[PDB]
Amino acid sequence: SGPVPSRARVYTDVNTHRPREYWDYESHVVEWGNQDDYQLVRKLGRGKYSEVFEAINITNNEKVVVKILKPVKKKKIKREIKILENLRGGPNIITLADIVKDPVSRTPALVFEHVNNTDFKQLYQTLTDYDIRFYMYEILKALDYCHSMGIMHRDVKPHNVMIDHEHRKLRLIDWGLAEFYHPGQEYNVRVASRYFKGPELLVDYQMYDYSLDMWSLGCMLASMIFRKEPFFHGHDNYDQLVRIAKVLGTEDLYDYIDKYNIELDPRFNDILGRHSRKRWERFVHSENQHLVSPEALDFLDKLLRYDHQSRLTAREAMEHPYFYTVVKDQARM
Numbered sequence: 110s111g112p113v114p115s116r117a118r119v120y121t122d123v124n125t126h127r128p129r130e131y132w133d134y135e136s137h138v139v140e141w142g143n144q145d146d147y148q149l150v151r152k153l154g155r156g157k158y159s160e161v162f163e164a165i166n167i168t169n170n171e172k173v174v175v176k177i178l179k180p181v182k183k184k185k186i187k188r189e190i191k192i193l194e195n196l197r198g199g200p201n202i203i204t205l206a207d208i209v210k211d212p213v214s215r216t217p218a219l220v221f222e223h224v225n226n227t228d229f230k231q232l233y234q235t236l237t238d239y240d241i242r243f244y245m246y247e248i249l250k251a252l253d254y255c256h257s258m259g260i261m262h263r264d265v266k267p268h269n270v271m272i273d274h275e276h277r278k279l280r281l282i283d284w285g286l287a288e289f290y291h292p293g294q295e296y297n298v299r300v301a302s303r304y305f306k307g308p309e310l311l312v313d314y315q316m317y318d319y320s321l322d323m324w325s326l327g328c329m330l331a332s333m334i335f336r337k338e339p340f341f342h343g344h345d346n347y348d349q350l351v352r353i354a355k356v357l358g359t360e361d362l363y364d365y366i367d368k369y370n371i372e373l374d375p376r377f378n379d380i381l382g383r384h385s386r387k388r389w390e391r392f393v394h395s396e397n398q399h400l401v402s403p404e405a406l407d408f409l410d411k412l413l414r415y416d417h418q419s420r421l422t423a424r425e426a427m428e429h430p431y432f433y434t435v436v437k438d439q440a441r442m
């Protein structure tokens with residue numbers, strides 16, 4: 110009788126307990142700023158849905174960053190703006206300063222407070238063991254905060270983390286795919302980038318939750334501690350799950366599919382075949398030796414679980430021994 114329903118283990122009713130205006134972004138009326146307050150200085154980069162510029166607010170002569178959006182539905186613009194406004198001030202969350210429209214073309218643009226143009230993906234393959242732990246913990250702070258505010262990021266990956274390494278500061282960016290979690294709601298499976306998609310997306314299970322982000326985080330952790338970019342290198346959507354199964358084994362995949370009564374495609378079953386689980390230790394080499402510890406492998410094993418309900422929450426992750434010294438060093442700084 111169709112897929113079994115699912116609920117988030119933590120922060121389940123966070124949005125129910127808030128006023129409707131908190132999460133009803135379609136009803137929200139956007140109050141647009143003045144684009145004439147901002148002059149673009151130079152280009153910083155670009156994405157599938159935006160172009161990113163360094164800019165100056167000439168009313169206060171403050172440096173800012175402007176993300177000019179490509180054409181998308183008004184609903185999605187309103188969603189991203191509401192989410193960013195709701196998370197403003199959160200630990201390690203980018204800070205929206207303004208929203209403007211071009212006077213002529215009416216093209217919308219988001220204005221953020223400035224941070225260092227250093228992408229985590231440019232640094233995370235050369236980190237010390239302790240730096241991997243430290244920056245993982247800072248990402249977790251962002252994820253626990255946004256989940257506690259009822260929001261799933263849904264595009265966690267190295268490219269969406271910015272690092273100011275001199276100040277050991279970190280920001281989670283690119284909230285264009287983020288959504289509010291509501292229990293019982295079915296969500297689009299066309300989220301996250303292929304190498305970071307959780308099994309729930311790859312089997313088209315729509316009643317997912319914050320734990321999607323925890324899978325993506327595990328994929329980042331594995332890539333860093335084994336120096337394999339990406340760790341699960343699928344060449345199409347079905348191959349992404351084949352590659353996962355060649356590591357986690359097919360037994361726990363079929364148990365997951367049965368648990369939620371997921372109806373897989375007949376010959377997707379044949380494609381998956383049968384694969385034994387590999388021990389995590391099998392991906393360690395002489396080069397990454399100093400980055401792999403018992404606690405790292407236990408932590409990774411507890412993030413990369415097929416059953417989304419079995420993965421560590423962000424707070425459970427932050428209390429894992431892998432961060433023990435990290436936590437003690439955060440109390441003295």
Ligand SMILES: CC(C)n1c2c(c3c1-c1c(Br)c(Br)c(Br)c(Br)c1C3=O)C(=O)CCC2
Nearest residue numbers: 153154155156161174221222224226282283
């Ligand atoms: C990697 C860089 C070019 N970049 C990208 C994005 C964003 C940035 C970026 C930078 Br740099 C800075 Br500084 C700030 Br502040 C902010 Br906000 C952003 C931001 O949102 C995307 O959203 C997707 C495409 C790549």
